Structure 1
Amino acid sequence: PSHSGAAIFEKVSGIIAINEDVSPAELTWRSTDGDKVHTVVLSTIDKLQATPASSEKMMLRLIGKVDESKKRKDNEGNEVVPKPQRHMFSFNNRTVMDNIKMTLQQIISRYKDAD
């Protein structure tokens, strides 16, 4: 339960499934048919996000880590923040949302706090 839930990815529906049997926990969206499987090892993830409670729609994100371009500002100042490569999953259940929210958030943060 607290690792998966029916999500939608690339215009097709399925389940999102976080697996910790493996090397650093990976999130796996697999279509309802099971043909499409996309695995995201959470160690490569920097953040994760979800739809605000004001919005009815259900969404999670996987914010993958970025280039070390978090480096200091440019000679022209620029003031740059490196654009993250992220994933977005559509659900239609708040319980799933909150669980997937928590599941991803915590494991990600386990790699951050590292305790």
Structure 2
Amino acid sequence: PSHSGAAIFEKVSGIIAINEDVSPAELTWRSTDGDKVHTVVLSTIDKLQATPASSEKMMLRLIGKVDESKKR
């Protein structure tokens, strides 16, 4: 439960599991029943957001990147 625990994405229960096995070490969110999967490559994550202790809503947010080919 260190780099892989029970995490949520799009309101469905899940199992986050960091995938550090490839050149980009990523964060694999795997639904608890397995319905929805979401892999977050920490390589692109600019900064992490954690609902601090003051944020009783314990929600962490993963700040990403704006790559030259993605800019809006």
TM range (shorter): 0.7 to 0.9
Give the fraction of aligned pairs with identical amino acids, expressed as a percent: 100
Q: CA separation in 1, counterparts of 2:70 and 2:7?
A: 31
Cα distance per residue 1:8-30 (max 9 Å; x no partner): 11111111111111221101111
SS of the residue corresponding to residue 22 of structure 1 reads coil
CA 69–6 in structure 1, closer or farther in 2 if over 3 Å, else same: same
Unaligned runs of 5+ in 1: 72-115
Q: CA separation in 2, counterparts of 1:68 and 1:47?
A: 18
Cα distance per residue 1:38-63 (max 9 Å; x no partner): 11111111111100111222111111
CA 18–54 in structure 1, closer or farther in 2 if over 3 Å, else same: same
SS of the residue corresponding to residue 65 of structure 1 reads coil
Unaligned runs of 5+ in 2: none
Q: Which has the higher contact order (CA 8 A, sep 6+)?
A: 1
Structure 1 length normalisation: TM-score? 0.53
Task: Measure how far apart 1:68 and its partner are.
Answer: 5.7
Task: Measure how far apart 1:65 and its partner are.
Answer: 0.8
Cα distance per residue 1:64-99 (max 9 Å; x no partner): 11256999xxxxxxxxxxxxxxxxxxxxxxxxxxxx
Q: Is the 8 A contact 2:9 2:38 kept in 1?
A: no
Q: CA separation in 1, counterparts of 2:69 and 2:26?
A: 25
Moved over 4 A (4+): 67-71
Aligned residues: 71
